[PDB]
A paper describes a structure:
A BLAST search identified Ard1 from Crenarchaeal Sulfolobus solfataricus (SsArd1) as a homolog of the Ard1 subunit of yeast NatA and Naa10p subunit of human NatA.
The CoA is bound to SsArd1 in a bent conformation in the pyrophosphate region, for pantetheine fitting to the narrow central cleft and the acetyl group reaching the midpoint of the tunnel. The main-chains of Ile92, Val94, Arg100, Gly102, Ala104 and Thr105 contribute to hydrogen bonding with CoA. The crystal structure of SsArd1 in complex with CoA revealed that Arg100 was the only residue contributing two hydrogen bonds to the 3′-phosphate of adenosyl moiety. The side-chain of Arg100 served as a position of adenosine moiety of CoA located at the cave formed by the α4 and β4-α3 loop. In contrast, the positive-charged guanidino group of the Arg100 residue of SsArd1 occupied the space and formed a cation-pi interaction with the adenosine group of CoA, which may force the acetyl group less deep into the catalytic pocket for larger protein N-terminal residues.
Author numbering: 11 to 167
The structure:
Amino acid sequence: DFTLRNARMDDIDQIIKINRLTLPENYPYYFFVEHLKEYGLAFFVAIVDNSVVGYIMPRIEWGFSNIKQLPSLVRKGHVVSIAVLEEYRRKGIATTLLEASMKSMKNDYNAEEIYLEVRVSNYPAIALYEKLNFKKVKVLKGYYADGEDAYLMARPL
Ligand SMILES: CC(C)(COP(=O)(O)OP(=O)(O)OC[C@H]1O[C@@H](n2cnc3c(N)ncnc32)[C@H](O)[C@@H]1OP(=O)(O)O)[C@@H](O)C(=O)NCCC(=O)NCCS
Ligand SMILES: [Ca+2]
C-alpha cells in the first residue's frame, strides 16, 4: 500500500532519480527546488515503505484560458511533471496524485482550470487523463525536442 504527502526538500534526490528513470525531460536540481518553494502546497509524493515511488510537480499561473474561446484571464494550474515507478503502476497512484494536486490548486491557489501537455504517443498517460475528464484542447505540433506532437489537455476545476 502507499500513502501521499507534500514533497519536502529531502525528497528531491529521489524525485530526480524517478524523473531520470521514467521521463526524457530531465530538469536540473534547482528547477525542482524552485517549484517546491513556490508551489509547494500542490507538490505531492507517493510513499511506499518510506521510499518515494512517484510525484507530481505543479506550477500556478495567471493568464489567458485555454478552455474559453475568446480572451479571458484566469488562474491556471499547470502539471509540469508526473511519474510513477514501473513496479508501482496500475495502483491508483497517479490518479490520487492528480486529485491531491488539483484540490490544492483549487483551494490554496484559486485556480479554475488545470492543464498539461502529453506526448501523442503516450497512451497510458492519455488514458489516465481522459478518465479524470481532461479534454484534448489542441495539438501542440512539434512540441517536443524530437519534433513529436503533444496534446494540450485541460479541464475546469
Ligand atoms: C502515466 C503514469 C503516471 C500513470 O501512473 P499510474 O499510477 O500507473 O496510473 P493509475 O494507477 O492511477 O491509473 C489510472 C487509470 O489510468 C489508465 N491507465 C494507466 N496506465 C495505463 C496503461 N498502462 N494502459 C492503459 N491505461 C492505463 C487506467 O484506466 C487506470 O485505471 P485502471 O488501472 O483501473 O485500468 C505512469 O504510467 C508513468 O509514471 N508513466 C511514465 C511517466 C509519464 O509518462 N508521465 C506522464 C507524462 S505527461
Ligand atoms: Ca509525455
